[PDB]
Structures are given as C-alpha cells and as structure tokens.
Amino acid sequence: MDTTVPTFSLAELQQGLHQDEFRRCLRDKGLFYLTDCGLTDTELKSAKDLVIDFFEHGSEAEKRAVTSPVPTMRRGFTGLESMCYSMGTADNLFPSGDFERIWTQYFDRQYTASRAVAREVLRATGTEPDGGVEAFLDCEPLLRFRYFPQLRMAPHYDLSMVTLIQQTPCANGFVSLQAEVGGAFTDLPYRPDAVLVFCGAIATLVTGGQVKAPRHHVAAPRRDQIAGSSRTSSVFFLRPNADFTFSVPLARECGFDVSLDGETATFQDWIGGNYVNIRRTS
Amino acid sequence: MDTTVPTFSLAELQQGLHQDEFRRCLRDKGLFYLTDCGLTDTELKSAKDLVIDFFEHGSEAEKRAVTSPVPTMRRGFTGLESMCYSMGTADNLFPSGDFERIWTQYFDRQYTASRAVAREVLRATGTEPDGGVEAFLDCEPLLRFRYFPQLRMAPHYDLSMVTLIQQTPCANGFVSLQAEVGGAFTDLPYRPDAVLVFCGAIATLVTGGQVKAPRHHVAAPRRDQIAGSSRTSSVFFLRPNADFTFSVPLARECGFDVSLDGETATFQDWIGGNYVNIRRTS
Amino acid sequence: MDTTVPTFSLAELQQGLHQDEFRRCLRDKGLFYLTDCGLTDTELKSAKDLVIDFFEHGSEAEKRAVTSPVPTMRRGFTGLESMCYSMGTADNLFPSGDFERIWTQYFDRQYTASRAVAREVLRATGTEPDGGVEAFLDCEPLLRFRYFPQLRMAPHYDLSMVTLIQQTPCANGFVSLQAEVGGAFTDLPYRPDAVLVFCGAIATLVTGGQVKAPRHHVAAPRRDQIAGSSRTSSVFFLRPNADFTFSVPLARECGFDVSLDGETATFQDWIGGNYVNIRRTS
Ligand SMILES: [Fe+2]
Ligand SMILES: [Fe+2]
Ligand SMILES: [Fe+2]
C-alpha cells in the first residue's frame, strides 16, 4: 500500500469520479486532503486575522462579554490550558458586527463543505442512514479555532462523522499535525489549496465498518523551532444529532465495544448526554 | 472590573443586602468568601485534629475497617495517589464514637451553610428550580477532607451547585489554591474567618447562565517551600439529585454541549449513572 | 493481617474447601493466585509464541487485515501507545488458520476458568444475581494480550466481575505488576503454575460489598533493567451483560457513588453505552 495521504477534488467526487480509489482511501486510511470544496486560503486568512486581532488586542471586558459562564469551548472565547474561539449554527457569541459577518460566512462555508464530503462518503459506501441522508447531515456541528503560542496534543481519534481542518503554518516550517498511515506517523502539512479531512468514528459506525477513523496527534518542536513555532488550526466537527439511530450488532461487528441492550440505539444512548469529540485508545 | 475575590456575609445576604453586588459577583466571577455562615475555625480544627490523628496513628486494621471495598472516595478512608476521609448524609464509616460525634456535627454545619448559600444564589437570580427550591437543595452532598504531604491538582471546574472549601495553611505561608479571575490566576488563601465558595456548573445550569463556574487548580511550591508545604482542605460538594430536571434548549444557550434529545432532561440523563464532581476544559 | 497474596486451587474451592479463608481473602484483599484451573504455562507459551511471531514478522498488510476500523482494542491487532491483540466470543480477526486454532482454544480455557472462579466468588458470598448465576456468567468477556517493549500503567481498579492475568516475566527478573495489599504495594510476579485473579468492581457490586476491588499498577524499571525489561501480559476481563440488574440502595451502601433515580438499575444505566474496563481513584 502506497502510504501517501491522497487528495480528492470534491467537485470530481460529486461527478462520480475516482470511486474505487475513494472507497479504498476511506477503508484503509480514513483521511485525505480535499480541494475544490469552496474553502479558500484568502477567506481562511480574513477570519484568522480578525480573531487573532481579538485574541491579541481585545480587553478583558470584551473577552468576558463573549465567554460562556461554563468553560466548555462550545461557544465564544476560551482562554485555554492557547486561546480558542468556538461557534455553531446558533447561540453564538461575537465581539463585533464585523467579526460576526466574517465568521458567519466562514462557518457556513465550512458546514457546507463538511456536509458535502460526508454525503460523498455515504454515497461511495452505499449507506443510507436510518432516517435518511439529509436528516443525518442536518446536525450538530462545532467549529473551534485555536491559536497555539510558540506532544502538544495527545494521540486520539475523532468521534465525528468527519472533521475538516484548516491550519496556518509554523513560520519556521515545522509540521506539527501527524496521523497514523500504514502503521507510521505521517506529516499533515498546511496546504493553501486544500482542507484536511479526518474521518471520525461515526463514519465507521454509520457505514458498517467501511471507513477507518485514524489516530492523530500534534507534535512539539525540538531544539531549532522554539523560534517560529506558533500555529493556528480551524477544526470543524460534523457531529450527529442525539437521535441518530444505528444497529447494535452491526456496531459490534466493526470494533465498537458497546454496552447496549437490545437491537438498535441512539448516539445519545452510546455516548451519553454531553458530546465527546475525541477518544484515546490508551 | 475589580479582580478582587469578594467576601459576603451570609447573614447580610439573607437580609436582602448587597444584591446587585452579589449578582454581579456570581455572573462575572462565580467565587467568593463567605463569612457569618456558622463555620468556625475552632471547629475546623477539632475535626481536622481527630482525622489527622487517625491518618497518623490509625493502624492498618483500623483503617481497613473504615475503607470501602471499592476505592471511590465516597465514604470513609482512602489512602491516595495524600490521605482522604469522605462522608455524606448516611452510609458513613467512622473510626470511633468520638470521631463520629465531631464529624457528624461538622458535616451538618457544612451542609446547612451550603444549602443556605445556594438558596441565596437562587433567590438573587430569580430562580425556581423545577420541582421547587427545597426539593432541589435536599440533595446528594459529598464532603472530602484531604491531607497533602509536604501542579498538585490540574485545572478544572466543579460540577456541583456550590462547593464550600475550608483549608489549613502551609506552615511556610505558600498559597496553593488558585482560581481564574479576570483572566488571571489569583490566590485563594486560607482565612480563619470565612469559607471559600466556588460556584459549580449546576449553578450555571439551573440559573439559565447567570452564574459562572470558575476554573481553579492547586499549585506546588518552588525551591524554598519543600519545607513547610503540607496542607489540608475540607471540600463540600453540594450536588443535585439524579432527578433534577432542566430545560435542554436553555442549557444549550449557556454553553452546555449537550447531546440530549427532547426538551427536558435530568441530571442523570446529562452526566450518567455515576456522579462526576469535576470537569477539565482541556 | 498477613499481607501475603494467597493461592487457592480452583478444584479445592469447587469441592467446598477453604471457604472461610476464601471469604476473608475476597473481603480484605480482593486478589489471589489460582491454581488447578486448566491454564498451563505450556499453552500460554504456544499462544504467546504465535502472536509474538505475528507482531514481529507480520507485514503491514497482514496487520491491516486484522485491524478494526476504529482503534478500540476490542478485536484484532492494535499498534499501541506496545502491541496488542484482542478477542472475545465472536467477531474475531485472526491472521491465519493456525493462529485461530491456538487462540480460540486459549480463549475458551480462559473463559471457562474465569466463569468457574466467579461462580465460586458468588457461592462463597451467598450471592444469587438478579436473573440467576448462569445468565450472569454468560456474559461479555474481553481478552487482551499486550507486548511491552524494553509507571508503565497508572493505578486503577478494574470494573470487571473478575480479571484473570497471565504474564511472561522480564528476562532480567524485574517484577512490574503491583497491587495494594494491606496498605502497601506488593509484587505480583509471574508464576508458571497459576493465574492471577483480580476482583473487579462488579464483584463488589453484585455481592453487596463482600468483595474488595483492589488498585494496582505496572511499574517501570530503574537503572539496571533497561536491558531485559520487555514483558507480556494476557488480561481476561469477565464483564457483565448490559442488562445486569442490581439494587441502587445496596450499591450506595458499599461505596458506589451512583447518580441513579429509582430502586434498581442496569450495568448500562450505571456505566453508559460503551464498556469501561478500568477506573482511577485519582
Ligand atoms: Fe482530532
Ligand atoms: Fe474543584
Ligand atoms: Fe487492571
């Protein structure tokens, strides 16, 4: 097996091209870069610029006005243990009308791209979710933008259907994001022309095991890269609704160690009453 | 914003004084010291003394007789990874009649103070829990007394309604407990005359977002304080009943990333079948 | 109290011998070695040999063919953060017909031994699970074989009914597995003639508190044992069905900090929709 992280054009997949190769990617790797999906670098930079300005120059009062009273990183600003800004389809917290305009447009484009790629994952695998495709994809997305100051993130897999990641690079050129591919950790660099897609465990679940959910991590630099090692990432989790329903025996056939009585269950039955975005194997 | 941790007299709040200031504390900080609440330092020291004597001089058999067969720190003694002693309203494990007398009185005073302050949090925010105030406050408290030998605790927020903390100081004067206030970690020293209150996430939940649940941590000393760095803390979690019921849309409006189908849910639906006292943002 | 880890012969316990001593072990220690239970060292070595050969010499494609698409360590091979091989009663992933023959026989013998010892734990404590003994023991076992390359595992207790552990030793003689016994960590060495049994929290639960679930950990070597410090362990979790039902008040009497409304609950109500094999006190 080639252990290259492939690139697919969303437009081409939508036209029914590369289906064998897309299926094989999904099963053997569960990650790919995605071009031609409406996500430009120029827009990335307009949303990045305005949030970095807020992180840098927003006063404590401005920051407090867009901070939830529980520090869950669901909505608004989180001073972290890094700085984060989160949003979804509603209940958002925005610093200014300008920020709101730029981030609503950016979110919507990320949501559209994620739905579209998930629709292709389902089609390529012959999967019709219980309740139909479009109700499955009208869901509970979460977008988190994180600034990291000059492992940085422990290995895990995502529990999303898909996760779309747009990064900014380290000024020093260090590549921080890595995933398991072919039994080896492989670099996932920034590309101005593409978004990185990770498949998550709900893809594996809904397709009956036809999609891998790869583990990944964020590495820290060694000696030379203290200097020039800040980076940012825009992480869009496409997450199912609480009432997404699946087959319990089918889940057990593809590695889910469920403790569910009966023949069908929901996402809420499986994960509980709070969303869990990631899981460690360890 | 002043980033001072304020002090309120429970008696004054009960008389309807300082309401604007109490509301603003609750929303912007979610922590305060509480005087005039029936918790003396002299009593703290009588309960502390008898449990420290047990920790120090109790034999393994004495300790085993008050150790639960699962090491959950719910009741009785836990030799930890520190030493802890836990209690609640019933099912307690006591080393001797004297200890029982002193710790039952101490627990009861902590429970009374916690209920009283929670009642003021609810009143100041205009909150009537589903099922009424008094059923909400007749709940599932947990008291944990921890001795720490000469970060010591990772940052988290509490999932209680409120948490009351009485500490003993480091002989060397180091201040170990810190909380986020105004975007900076701030010292929370021992005060002989007051108990520290942290608001927890259930306060945020039940009030519809009018109360912050602050993050906090316990720091370790640097070079000078190896010597004189032991301390103790009495941590009283006021925790809701499993059947405490709340609005799902309201929860989503104030930062809770719930995965709950339908319009109302219980605490058990949200957190699951075992109590979870704390949560990390990370 | 003697703080020796005792040995019992399963055959003798089955004949009704040593009952007082077995009860006292279960309550005060919750761990023992088990002889005369159908688990030989020769068989251990035949299963170990064939899986170590696979770990060493299996190609990435061979490994991929027996890797689940979600990395849960439920079934098949997991390249870890060490290498693991997992199996249960069905849905297994086997590298070759020979491996399948040897590992099916090995699993079955481990399952038989675990059921048998659990049956004695129940009998010695006078326990009839809701729904009867044999339905309780026809359950959801998980076997995990781990190779460790030259703490290595944080302290926890198991959430199984019982856990059977067969190890291979460090070539250098270092003893890595340790458990709390009598308030001190005690060595649990490899024995060619016996399997180690840990009681888990479901034993404590189903018996109404008559069985301790001990904490344990895996230590790393110091200076001399870098060399000769690889080891393996075969860990068999005997885990209840999702619908195992118990008394909520009884659970609270023996240390379980449950958040369960009502008088009875299931294992799924308590732990949720995914199996959780271990728990930290910390
Ligand atoms: Fe991730
Ligand atoms: Fe806390
Ligand atoms: Fe264990």
b/e A34-59 (16+ beta carbons within 10 angstroms → b): bebbebeeebbeebbebbbebbeebe
* Rounded distance between C-alpha atoms, residue A240 and residue A161, angstroms: 7
* Rounded distance between C-alpha atoms, residue B46 and residue B48, angstroms: 5
**Residue of A215, A273, A266, A209 lying closest to A31 (CA atoms):** A215
Tell me, yes or no, if B27 is annotated catalytic: no
DSSP, collapsed to helix, strand or coil, labels residue A211 as coil
Residue A217 forms beta bridges with which residues?
Answer: A178
**Residue of A219, A215, A205 lying closest to A282 (CA atoms):** A215
DSSP code at position C254 = T
DSSP sequence for A10-68: HHHHHTT-SHHHHHHHHHHT-EEEEESSS--HHHHHHHHHHHHHHHHH--HHHHHTTB-
The rounded Å distance from CA B71 to ligand 3 centre is 14
How far does B22 lie from chain A, in Å, by closest CA? Answer: 16
Maximal CA-CA distance, chain A: 56
Residue B153 forms beta bridges with which residues?
Answer: B218
**Residue B267 Cα to chain centre, angstroms:** 18
* Rounded distance between C-alpha atoms, residue B187 and residue C46, angstroms: 60
Inter-chain contact A213–C71, Cβ cutoff 8 Å?
Answer: yes
Query: Helices then strands (H, E): number in chain B?
Result: 9, 15
The rounded Å distance from CA A165 to ligand 1 centre is 9
Number of structural domains found in chain B: 1
CA–CA–CA angle A182, A258, C142 (5° rounding): 75
Neighbours of C193 (CB within 10 A): 11
DSSP code at position A224 = G
C177 touches C146 (CB < 8 A): no
- Which of C27, C74, C144, C279 is labelled catalytic? C74
Question: What is the torsional sign of CA A37, A43, A48, A54?
Answer: negative
Inter-chain contact A74–B257, Cβ cutoff 8 Å?
Answer: yes
Tokens of A46: 């307009």
Residue A186 forms beta bridges with which residues?
Answer: A179
Could you tell me the residue range of the domain that residue C226 belongs to? 1-282
Q: Which residues of chain B are at the A interface, by a Cβ-Cβ cutoff of 8 Å? A: 1, 27-28, 30, 155, 157, 180, 182-183, 201, 204-205, 209-213, 215, 252-261, 265, 269-272, 281-282
Contacts of residue B125 in chain A, CB cutoff 8 Å?
none
Q: Residue B61: which residues within 8 A CB-CB, separation 6 or more?
A: C1
- Chains touching B (at least 3 CB pairs under 8 A) are A, C
Q: Which residues of chain C are at the B interface, by a Cβ-Cβ cutoff of 8 Å? A: 1, 27-28, 30, 155, 157, 180, 182-183, 201, 204-205, 209-213, 215, 252-261, 265, 269-272, 281-282
Burial of B134 per CB tally in 10 Å (0-12, 13-18, 19+): exposed
Inter-chain contact C243–A260, Cβ cutoff 8 Å?
Answer: no
Residue C147 forms beta bridges with which residues?
Answer: C83, C232
* Rounded distance between C-alpha atoms, residue B215 and residue C116, angstroms: 48
* Rounded distance between C-alpha atoms, residue C53 and residue C98, angstroms: 12
* Rounded distance between C-alpha atoms, residue B74 and residue C257, angstroms: 6
Inter-chain contact C252–B91, Cβ cutoff 8 Å?
Answer: yes
**Rounded to the nearest 5°, which phi and psi values hold at A258?**
-75, 150
Tokens of C185: 């960590």
Maximal CA-CA distance, chain C: 56
Tokens of C5: 């880890």
* Rounded distance between C-alpha atoms, residue C158 and residue A66, angstroms: 42
Inter-chain contact C60–A183, Cβ cutoff 8 Å?
Answer: yes
The rounded Å distance from CA B157 to ligand 2 centre is 6
Q: What is the 3-state secondary structure (H, E, C) of A123-152?
A: HHCCCCCCCCHHHHHCCCCEEEEEEECCCC
Residue A153 forms beta bridges with which residues?
Answer: A218
The rounded Å distance from CA C161 to ligand 3 centre is 12
Contacts of residue A205 in chain C, CB cutoff 8 Å?
70
Q: Residue B183: which residues within 8 A CB-CB, separation 6 or more?
A: A60, A63, A64, A79
Contacts of residue C180 in chain B, CB cutoff 8 Å?
79
How far does C137 lie from chain A, in Å, by closest CA? Answer: 16
Specify the experimental method.
Answer: X-ray
**Residue of A184, A233, A214 lying closest to A279 (CA atoms):** A214
B265 touches B256 (CB < 8 A): no
Q: Which residues of chain C are at the A interface, by a Cβ-Cβ cutoff of 8 Å? A: 60-61, 63-64, 68-76, 78-81, 91, 140, 142, 241-243, 266-268, 271-275
Q: Which residue of C has its CA nearest to A282?
A: C81
Q: Residue B64: which residues within 8 A CB-CB, separation 6 or more?
A: C1, C28, C183
Resolution in A: 1.5
Pairing of strands C7-9, C31-35: parallel
How far does A154 lie from chain C, in Å, by closest CA? Answer: 10
Contacts of residue C135 in chain A, CB cutoff 8 Å?
none
Inter-chain contact C274–A282, Cβ cutoff 8 Å?
Answer: no
Pick from C213, C260, C270: which is nearest to B70 by CB?
Answer: C213
Pick from C1, C157, C270: which is nearest to B71 by CB?
Answer: C157
Pick from A211, A261, A281: which is nearest to C73 by CB?
Answer: A281
B182: left (phi over 0), alpha (psi -120 to 50) or beta: left
The rounded Å distance from CA B158 to ligand 2 centre is 5
Inter-chain contact B275–C258, Cβ cutoff 8 Å?
Answer: yes
How far does A173 lie from chain B, in Å, by closest CA? Answer: 26
Neighbours of C255 (CB within 10 A): 26
DSSP sequence for A157-178: EE-SSEEEEEEE--TT----EE
CATH number at residue C165: 2.60.120.330
The tally of CA atoms less than 13 A away on the side-chain side of residue B145 is 22
C213 touches C200 (CB < 8 A): yes
**Locate tokens 């460790």: which residue?**
C148
DSSP code at position B199 = E
**Locate tokens 């009785």: which residue?**
B76
Inter-chain contact C70–A201, Cβ cutoff 8 Å?
Answer: yes
Contacts of residue A186 in chain C, CB cutoff 8 Å?
none
Whole-number Cα distances in Å, B193 to B35, B48, B162, C223: 6, 16, 19, 51
Inter-chain contact A140–B253, Cβ cutoff 8 Å?
Answer: no
- Which of B23, B27, B74, B123 is labelled catalytic? B74
Contacts of residue B73 in chain C, CB cutoff 8 Å?
281
* Residues of A carrying an active site annotation: 74
Neighbours of C185 (CB within 10 A): 15
The rounded Å distance from CA B277 to ligand 2 centre is 8
Nearest ligand, CA of residue C280? Answer: 3
Selected for mutation to probe chain B from C248, C257, C261, C270 (highest B CB count within 10 Å) is C257
Identify residues whose C-beta is under 5 A from ligand 1, the ion: A 158
**Locate tokens 């597995």: which residue?**
C177
DSSP, collapsed to helix, strand or coil, labels residue B90 as coil
Q: What is the 3-state secondary structure (H, E, C) of C188-206?
A: CCCCCCCEEEEECHHHHHH
Q: Residue A10: which residues within 8 A CB-CB, separation 6 or more?
A: A34, A35, A36, A37, A113, A116, A117, A120
